[PDB]
Amino acid sequence: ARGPKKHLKRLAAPHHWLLDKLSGCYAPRPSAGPHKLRESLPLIVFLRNRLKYALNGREVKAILMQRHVKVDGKVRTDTTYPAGFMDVITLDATNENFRLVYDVKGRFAVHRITDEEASYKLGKVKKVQLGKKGVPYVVTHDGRTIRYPDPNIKVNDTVKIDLASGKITDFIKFDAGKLVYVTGGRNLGRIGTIVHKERHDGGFDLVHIKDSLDNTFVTRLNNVFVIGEQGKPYISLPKGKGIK
Amino acid sequence: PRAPRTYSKTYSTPKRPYESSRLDAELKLAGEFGLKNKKEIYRISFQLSKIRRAARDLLTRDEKDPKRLFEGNALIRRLVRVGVLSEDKKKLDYVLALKVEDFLERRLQTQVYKLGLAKSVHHARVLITQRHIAVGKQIVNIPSFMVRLDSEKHIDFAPTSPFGGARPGRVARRNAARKAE
Amino acid sequence: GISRDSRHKRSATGAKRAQFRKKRKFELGRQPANTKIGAKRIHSVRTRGGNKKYRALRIETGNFSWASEGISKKTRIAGVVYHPSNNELVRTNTLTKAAIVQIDATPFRQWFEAHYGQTRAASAKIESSVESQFSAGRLYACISSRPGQSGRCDGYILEGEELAFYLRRL
Amino acid sequence: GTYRKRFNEKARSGHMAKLKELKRIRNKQFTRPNANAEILSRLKKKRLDKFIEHQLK
RNA sequence: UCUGGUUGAUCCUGCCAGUUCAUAUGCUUGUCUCAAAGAUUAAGCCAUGCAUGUCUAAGUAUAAGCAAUUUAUACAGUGAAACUGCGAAUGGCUCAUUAAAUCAGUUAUCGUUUAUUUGAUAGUUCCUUUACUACAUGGUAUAACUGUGGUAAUUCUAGAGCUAAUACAUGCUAAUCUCGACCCUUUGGAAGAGAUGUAUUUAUUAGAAAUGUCUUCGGACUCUUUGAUGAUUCAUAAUAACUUUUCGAAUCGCAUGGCCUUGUGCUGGCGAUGGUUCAUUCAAAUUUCUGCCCUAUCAACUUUCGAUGGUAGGAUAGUGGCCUACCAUGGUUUCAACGGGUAACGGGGAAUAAGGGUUCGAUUCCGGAGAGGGAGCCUGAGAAACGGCUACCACAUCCAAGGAAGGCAGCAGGCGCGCAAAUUACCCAAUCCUAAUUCAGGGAGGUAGUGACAAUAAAUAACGAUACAGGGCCCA
RNA sequence: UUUACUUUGAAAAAAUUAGAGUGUUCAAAGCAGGCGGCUCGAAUAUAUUAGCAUGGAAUAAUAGAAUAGGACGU
Ligand SMILES: [Mg+2]
Ligand SMILES: [Mg+2]
Ligand SMILES: [Mg+2]
Ligand SMILES: [Mg+2]
Ligand SMILES: [Mg+2]
Ligand SMILES: [Mg+2]
Ligand SMILES: [Mg+2]
Ligand SMILES: [Mg+2]
Ligand SMILES: [Mg+2]
Ligand SMILES: [Mg+2]
Ligand SMILES: [Mg+2]
Ligand SMILES: [Mg+2]
Ligand SMILES: [Mg+2]
Ligand SMILES: [Mg+2]
Ligand SMILES: [Mg+2]
Ligand SMILES: [Mg+2]
Ligand SMILES: [Mg+2]
Ligand SMILES: [Mg+2]
Ligand SMILES: [Mg+2]
Ligand SMILES: [Mg+2]
Ligand SMILES: [Mg+2]
Missing domain, CATH: 2.40.50.740 (Ribosomal protein S4, central domain)
Structure with a gap:
């Protein structure tokens, strides 16, 4: 190409969005923003395909131009705004607060939080x-x-x-025994405690994680996110608590 | 462009269509179950071949193998639900013992004949295609419809049918009008 | 017409490669700016992105540094005496980086006299060769800037082993 | 398909010029303005060679 | 691959006869769902129409526009035209070229640019002509518009008169912080001694036994003082100069709150658009390792005109023989270099097969390349762009013969034969993209039409009664 | 000792392939949530080579100051 792309085929879209393959020819292309394209949930997908408050993109635009949606406490009017991991989405008219966290399936879960947890x-x-x-x-x-x-x-x-x-x-420091959340790979969505960080100079560091059922797995350090001390996370966790 | 839609063939031509034993078997089957052509027999044989090949592969695996347990249980449950496999024969060994007639007895045409709503398999086919039969609340006009164990006792004449409590069809009321005139 | 692509060259084995594609704008070059001594003539170039380069087509002054004394003075450039890449650049008096030039010694001499009160004595002592140049009236300098890239002809006064080396080469 | 016959070689003479240049450098071992300006057969002769040598004989 | 023959009867070796996909084509073709549409190695040539524009309250309206009004006093509703801004570098099509090239997996940028998005970020008090615009500068200026015109002809334009800005070009307005004698002993006051942006180029510099005393039993008394990477001349900081040299808000909507010494005084809300540098995101360019079909009746190749490498410069966004100058004589190769062929874009994939294999992959996704053929460029963050420009080759349209205008491998639709095959259809409602923007635009895309592509289900009948006759069928 | 080799783990887009659930009226298909906490629900898998991390006792290469030496002069 001669410059940046502006479209996205539905088959080429991130799999975890769960888009119907026959619905159309294109998926919402996330705009530049806080999160990367493949690691983001645009507001249209959240408002239409997850919450069902809108039946199509035009009603998503109608909702957004009323200034009803806040992302991390700020009003966003862009339909493909790339919300992502740990983002707080507030809908005041519905009295709803959501935090974007993956479930064990590896997809962003519709996780409702309290107004006290919505503040950080x-x-x-x-x-x-x-x-x-x-x-x-x-x-x-x-x-x-x-x-x-x-x-x-x-x-x-x-x-x-x-x-x-x-x-x-x-x-929270990154150290053994801390509670971590896997944000990439095939273990995306699992929760455990750090056991050991295998270091390789000039290469990719590796982290061993032990879940509450005592199963151990290895993940690259890039996919690990510290969320608290074992038995005391700093955020409410989705159903299943990242098991299996 | 829009993503491709999947499709598949539901039947296959046999290895040697011209064997005399095969022709006689097909004659007996089509006559006993009122089938239209050999393609229906081929379709059922294709399904049964897939099922029995799957059961063979699962039986090759070790007992207590996770794949064997999972897929064998799924296959057995499906065959029991559709009524082909009995409740007392819930093993893959009896899955390998199945035959085409077991599947043909579960067709809605055969069930409509056997429950006494029709005087033959051909009358049953005519009744089904003419929108006279309901499975539960639903009119089914497909003779190849496969009846489940729970669905078996819900086959009846449809509410809209002249045989199901509605008014007579065009022929009856035309004749009555001309007789009155 | 200038391109910097490596596809037109032979492979390391010696094979003749075939043309993969037409020339791209992201692999271009431009005409050299053969900077020469004279009245200041500089023109801007719009480079990749919105960024701009400065082409010194002509220049006769520069900010030259006395590193031992830790100072910089603006000075007139007299001429190019030596160039390590090509002698025709010396023949035509073309200013590039690494060229050895002669600069007017006047501002440095004035600073030295003002700062040391001499034409204290131990600190005023400098190399014999540099002082001989000051007597001559011109100082040997090396250009440290890239005139065709930044538009500046900055440099420094040769001292020590480098000065001995270039005095031999002259 | 570097030098394969083309449907209309005359309509792409510029392309044919490159191919001749590519052949020259490739086969060399065997042998051994500005547009953007403001103002702009053998048998018979061999058989003949046999007669004259015969006639001269 | 099997079956039957060649004997008086067997075995082996031979002979004879019968045993999906691809292309082209013949006949038939009712119903439901669904779905595709290449091919002369001709990437051959194309009539006509369409396929890229875009405006919020929020850049610029005295349209001699429309419409309103408490009938207008700078303007104010709505708004053609034009300027300004953004987009037009995405999408769609095709497979010609291309054989370590593309591509696949795996790396690097401590080797570079990056509009936009998201997050951070810029009181420099003073410094003689204060002879002083900041209660706010100029034409160093124009379009649309008015009017006078040339040409056969085009999205051709000339002379003259006007007038704006977030266009263009200029240029300003009693601070903060260190210590702090002295008092006073804190909620302290402050005589005084000091300090003071960015950006550009270069040089230089930094970046490594207090184990006590007192105390109110608390606490105080002296000292510490960059960070990161596996790794840096890294981040960052400092000094001296340097610069045709930057930036450091002369912009716009809505609204009318607060102090008073009552002045159209001072102050002040929620937004829009801009702006320096850093980070981030969308990207880009390069880049490490391994992996391609046939050919050895291609064995040596590269290096004169860069081939391999060194030093320096030039150019580049930047590394690099990328180019130049001067030096060495290197680099590849029977573990197949180099050259030749390819009906060679690569892959995910498709077919077949018991397994190994073998064939196919223009073709819904990803990557690359091209826009009749070579070559070169403008603008722009981004193009070596082609529904942008300039030349040359080849074709070809109009002409008043002076000139002017061209690129369907985009969607429909034609020619390429004298022999043949989808509609020059409807719409942006869904999907998404673009814009100043919820609204406008989109042959992208969708809807329907049209040769049985490949597929799914499935009608063309069902049930009775009576009469007559004696033969019907199977093997051999 | 090191390598080859072999085990395990990441990686190898989606669609396609296999597999699970689901009366699209059946089917080819498409599809992920239901009841008022219920211990309910695709549980998923798949890829020769190259690079990365890792457990190995054989096999095949590769290594050892391995089981070495002790007499003279002015
Ligand atoms: Mg493109
Ligand atoms: Mg992983
Ligand atoms: Mg009816
Ligand atoms: Mg009908
Ligand atoms: Mg605006
Ligand atoms: Mg070749
Ligand atoms: Mg924009
Ligand atoms: Mg910003
Ligand atoms: Mg530095
Ligand atoms: Mg160099
Ligand atoms: Mg050279
Ligand atoms: Mg080809
Ligand atoms: Mg493509
Ligand atoms: Mg191109
Ligand atoms: Mg053409
Ligand atoms: Mg632009
Ligand atoms: Mg071009
Ligand atoms: Mg075109
Ligand atoms: Mg184009
Ligand atoms: Mg066409
Ligand atoms: Mg289309």
Whole structure:
């Protein structure tokens, strides 16, 4: 091609969206945004194919232009806005709050949360670095830049971001015995505790995870997301608690 | 373009169509069950071949094998539900003992004849295609419809049928009108 | 017509490759800017993205650094004396990176006299060769900038082993 | 299919020019303005060779 | 692959006879659902029509537009035209070229650009002509429009007169922070000593036994002071200059709250669009390893005109013989180099088979390439674009003969024969994409029509009564 | 000791293939949620080679200061 693509065939769309193959020729192409294309749920898919509040794209646009939908506390009017893992979606007229978490099947689950839990989210630290004027900052998995982080925060840790202010309230270090959630691979959606991080310099690090049933599995460190201490997650978990 | 839609053939031509034993067997089958052509027999033979080949492959596997348990139980349950396999023969060994007549006895045409709603298999076919038969609340006009164990006792004349309590058909009321005139 | 693709070249075995596709804009080159000493003539080039380069078609001044003294002064460039890639660039007085040029010594001499009060004594001591150049009136300098890329003709004064090397080569 | 016969070789003379150039470099071992400007047979002779040699004989 | 013959009767070796898919074509063709539509190695040639435009309250209306009004006093509703902005680099089609190339899996960028999206981010107080616009600068300026015109002719345009901006081009407006003597002992005051953006180019620099004393029993007394990677000349910071040199809001909607020393004073809400740098996302370019059909009656090839490598420069977004200059003489090859053929785009896949194999894959998804053939470019974040431009080759249309205009391998529809095959249909309602934008646009896409492509189910009859006759069938 | 080899684990898009559930009236198909907590529901699998992590005692290569030496001069 001579520049960026703007369409998406339904067969080429992410499988976990569960789109009917005969419905049309195209799927909603997620727009640029906080999350990657394959790892995102556009608002149209959530509002129409998961919640069924809209019967088609035109009613999704009607809902969005009324300013009824908030993503992480901010109104979004873009139909293909790429909501993703750990995103909070608020619908005030229905008194509904959702957090985007995969189920054991590997698909984003319709997980309803309370208004108290809707006030924060968790971000995996992707980068810690000094910005201009020597101000440190952290970049999280959803593209948030947060300045003046606690000096103890490192990469692969998790921070608790208050949505109203976008500031770090607490953090969890990546260490053995921490509760982790698998966000990629064939174990996508499983929950367990870190047993060992196998390190390979110049290669991909590997993490052994033990589930509550004592089954062990190995995953790349890129697919691991710390969510709390064992027996005490920082977020409400979907049905099944990431087992099997 | 839009994604492809799947399809498949439901039958296959036999290895040697011209064997005298095969022709005589087909004659007896089509006569006893009132079949239209050899393609219906081929369709049933194709299904039975798939089922028995699956059972053979599962029996080759070790007992207590997870695949054997899962797929054999599914196959046995399906065959018992459709009525071909008896409740007292819930094993793959008896799945290998099945025959085409077992499936032909489950056709709605055969059931309509056997329950006494029709005087022959051909009268049963005519009754089904003419919208006189209901399975439960549903009119079924397909003779090859496969009756389940639970569905067996719900075969009846349809509410809309002249034989099911509705008014007479065109012929009867035409004759009555001319007789009155 | 300039392209930087590697497909037109022979394989490492020596095989002649066939044309895969027509030339692409993302693999182009442009005409060199043979910068020469004279009144400042610079024209912008719109490069990939919105970015811009500066083509020094002509230049006669530059910011040259005395690294031992830790200073920089703007100075007139007299001419090109030596070039390690091609002598025709010296013959035509073409300014590129790594060219050895002669620069006016006046601003550096003035700074030295102001700072050291001399034409303290230990700190004022410099290399014999540099002081001999100051007596001559011109200093040997090496251009550290890329004139055809940034539009600047910055450089530094040759000292020590590098100065000895280039004095031999001259 | 580098040098296969084309339906209309005259209509693509520019393409044929490249092919001749490609052959030359490839087979060399065996042998051994600006448009964007503002202003712009053998048997018979052999058989004949047999007569004259015969007649001269 | 089997079956029957060749003997008085067997065995072996031979002979004889019978034993889906692809192309073309013949006849028949009622009902339901469903679905496809290539082919002269001719990527041969195309009449006609359509397939890309786009406006919110929120960039620019004295249209001599329309319509309103408490009948208008800068404007204000709605709004053609034109400017400005964005898109037109996606989509759709085709398989010509292409044999370590594309492609598949697997890597790298500590080797580079990236519109847009998302998140962060920029008080520099002062510094002589204060002879001072910031209660806000210019034409260094125009379109539409008005009017006068040329040409046979085109989405051709000339001369003249006007007038805007988020176009273009200029240019401003008593701060904050360190210590802090002295008082006072805190909710402290502050004499005073000091400090002060970005962007560009270069040079230089940093980036590594207090185990005590007192105390109110708390606490205080002296010291610490960058981070990351497996790894960096990394992030970041500092000094001195440098620059045809940047940026640091002269923009727009809705609304009319708060202080008073009552002034059209000061202050002030929710938004739109912009803007520097970083991060992110959508991408792009390059890149590591392994893997292709036939040919050895192709054994040496590459290097003169870059082939392999070194140094330096130039160019590039950037690495690199990518190019140039000067140096070496290297690089590949019987483990098949190089050359030749390919009715060679690669793959996911399809067919067959008991297994090994073998054939097919233009063809719904992904990647690549092309737009009659070579070559070159403008604009732009992005194109070596072709429903963009310029030349040359080949075809070809109009002409008043002076000129002007071309690219269906997009959707329909034609020619390529004298012998043959879907509609020049309806619509953006669904799917999604584009725009300034919920609304406009979309031959993308969908709807229906049209040779039995491949498939699914399935009618053309069912049930009775009576009369007559004596033969009907099977084997051999 | 190292390699080959072999085991296990990631990886190898979706569609297609196999398989599970589901009276599209049947079927070819398409499809993921039901009742008022119910311990209900695709449980899923599949790929020669190359690269990555990992357990191995044989086999085939590959290694050893392995079981070595101790006499003279001015
Ligand atoms: Mg394209
Ligand atoms: Mg994994
Ligand atoms: Mg009826
Ligand atoms: Mg009908
Ligand atoms: Mg606007
Ligand atoms: Mg070749
Ligand atoms: Mg945009
Ligand atoms: Mg931004
Ligand atoms: Mg640096
Ligand atoms: Mg170089
Ligand atoms: Mg050279
Ligand atoms: Mg070809
Ligand atoms: Mg394609
Ligand atoms: Mg192209
Ligand atoms: Mg053509
Ligand atoms: Mg553009
Ligand atoms: Mg072109
Ligand atoms: Mg066209
Ligand atoms: Mg195009
Ligand atoms: Mg066409
Ligand atoms: Mg179409």
